[PDB]
């Protein structure tokens, strides 16, 4: 609205500052403690209410993070607490707020609401309408970013549909339709191949002559994602290559006698693999946009020889699916909403794994520590796998956050074959950091394969365990 | 209704006597055969748990009495 420009005097605070949260939380907890201590007993009859108030304190049951709080009233020996004295205490909370300005929004129904998460009998109910699909916030009237950054929001739609228990065959199938709709733009026009989206964490359906609906969307993104499905499908892929004239004379240690370079160049798998690593940010004009477009077209015109040094160093490791692990939680227990035996794959993964019920400095010091070279402490100690294996930029993905990756890394990924020691998988006593990366390379395929998460054992490293990590050290020298 | 549609899925997942038996009675890819082979072992190792073998959700007319 033009001609609308003024100033205004309030007593309120700014909306989203940082220090405006902490002191409000302190002020929440202090007034709740003096409620339960002093104002409580001094303003009520009905000694059931008095006995209820004198039994709880805010260290034992009160949790607050902002304006909102959650107070928990535990069960006694006789069962649950009488649900009428709780309401008589609720009226006293509402009366207590009026004496100094707070207008509480107390609620008592039998559920729990805290940080806008909805539970009933321990339920994990997702709010599907918390974020819409076709909805985006715009505060100003300015134009938006150019075209090749819309795919980040499309992947955001997909990863937000992951955490909510959608019908997974329908959800992946609709994600493909969006994924293929947002792929071409006028500038020869620009176009992403379909493998560039597989790099971004999007699972597939049926490729290379395989079974349909064969992988899961719990697969990671990046090189750890590209390792897993290839290492699961590889003896079928090397058959499908030879199935139409893609034979060379020498045998590769990975794909055998088939020219993976020509097959991947003609099918444009390499070009999607390297084209997905281009920056989608038009960093600091239409001519910079044209610079980014020419940089993006150059990756499509260039023909490629192999994958990155990290993925090629990964692909020498072979695992095995011997036997399924014992379950971690009851099948008939409703843990999480939406997922059920009708939603088959998360229902299998969440029972077999179990739900979670229990940076530049850290990078570069490990870069200089693993290569031959607090600062006096780091040299000999070790950290866990999820911290020690960040030296090759491996991270537990966004998808595995609502599961138990700790027990899976610690126990159910064995770095030793079932029939003893194959003499090929001999990690030296020196350079024992390799174990923390082999944990991730093991736990990739045990999560990408649909169905039950299976106990996985080490089988083979082709170049030897000593010569395996020299490739990682070459990547560390090359940065 | 969904109450039947979920029960059919539970019965599709959980599926399949005390007598002496008679003579009458490297790498691998991923296959739906191997998926079912893992799932049946998982359901068997869950089904033979002793609390699962006895416990039920609804008490009967003897337990209520």
């Amino acid at each position: 609205s033009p001609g609308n420009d003024f100033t205004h005097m309030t007593t309120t605070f700014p909306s989203g500052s940082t220090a405006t949260s902490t002191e409000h939380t302190a002020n929440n907890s202090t007034m709740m403690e003096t409620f339960l201590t002093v104002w409580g007993p001094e303003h009520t009859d009905d000694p059931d209410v008095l006995r209820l108030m004198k039994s709880l304190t805010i260290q034992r049951n009160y949790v607050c993070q902002g304006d909102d709080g959650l107070m928990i009233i535990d069960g006694n020996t006789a069962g649950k607490v009488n649900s009428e004295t709780i309401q008589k205490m609720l009226e006293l909370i509402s009366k207590y707020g009026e004496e100094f300005g707070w207008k509480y929004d107390i609620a008592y129904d039998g559920t729990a609401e805290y940080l806008k998460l909805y539970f009933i009998f321990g339920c994990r109910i997702p709010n599907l309408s918390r974020h819409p699909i076709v909805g985006k916030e715009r505060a100003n009237s300015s134009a938006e970013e150019p075209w090749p950054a819309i795919l980040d929001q499309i992947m955001g739609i997909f990863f937000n549909g992951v955490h909510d228990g959608l019908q997974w065959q329908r959800w992946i199938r609709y994600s493909w339709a969006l994924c293929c709709a947002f792929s071409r733009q006028r500038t020869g026009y620009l176009q992403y191949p379909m493998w560039s989206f597989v790099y971004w964490g999007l699972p597939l359906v049926k490729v290379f002559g395989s079974d349909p609906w064969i992988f899961s969307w719990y697969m990671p993104t990046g090189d750890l994602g590209m390792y897993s499905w290839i290492s699961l499908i590889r003896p079928l892929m090397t058959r499908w290559m030879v199935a139409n004239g893609y034979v060379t004379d020498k045998c590769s240690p990975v794909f055998g006698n088939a020219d993976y370079r020509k097959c991947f160049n003609e099918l444009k798998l390499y070009q999607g693999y390297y084209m997905a690593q281009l920056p989608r940010n038009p960093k600091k004009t239409r001519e910079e946009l044209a610079e980014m477009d020419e940089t993006l077209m150059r990756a499509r015109k260039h023909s490629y020889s192999s994958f990155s040094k990290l993925l090629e160093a990964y692909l020498l490791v072979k695992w095995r699916m011997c036997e399924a692990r014992e379950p971690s939680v009851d099948l008939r227990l409703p843990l999480c909403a939406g997922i059920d035996p009708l939603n088959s794959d998360p229902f299998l993964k969440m029972v077999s794994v179990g739900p979670m019920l229990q940076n530049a400095i850290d990078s570069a010091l490990l870069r200089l520590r693993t290569l031959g070279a607090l600062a006096g402490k780091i040299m000999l100690q070790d950290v866990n796998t999820v911290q020690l294996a960040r030296v090759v930029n491996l991270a537990v993905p966004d998808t595995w956050m609502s599961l138990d990756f700790d027990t899976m890394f610690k126990h159910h990924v064995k770095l030793l074959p079932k029939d003893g020691r194959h003499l090929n998988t001999d990690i030296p006593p020196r350079m024992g950091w390799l174990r923390a990366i082999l944990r991730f390379l093991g736990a990739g395929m045990a999560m990408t394969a649909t169905g039950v998460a299976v106990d996985i054992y080490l089988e083979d490293i082709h170049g030897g365990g000593r010569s395996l990590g020299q490739r990682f050290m070459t990547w560390m020298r090359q940065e | 209704p969904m109450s039947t549609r979920i029960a059919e899925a539970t019965s599709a997942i959980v599926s399949k006597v005390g007598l002496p038996p008679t003579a009458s009675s490297g790498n691998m890819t991923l296959t739906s055969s191997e998926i079912q082979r893992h799932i049946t072992e998982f359901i068997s190792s869950w089904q033979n748990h002793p609390i699962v073998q006895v416990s039920a959700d609804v008490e009967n007319r003897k337990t209520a009495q």
Binding site: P235, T238, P253, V254, G256, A258 | G26, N27
Partner: peptide
């Protein structure tokens, strides 16, 4: 006329397979 189990290379005759 099947493949190997070391490097997954396919063969056509059983002689060079062996």
């Amino acid at each position: 006329g099947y493949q190997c189990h070391v490097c997954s290379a396919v063969l056509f005759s059983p002689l060079d397979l062996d």
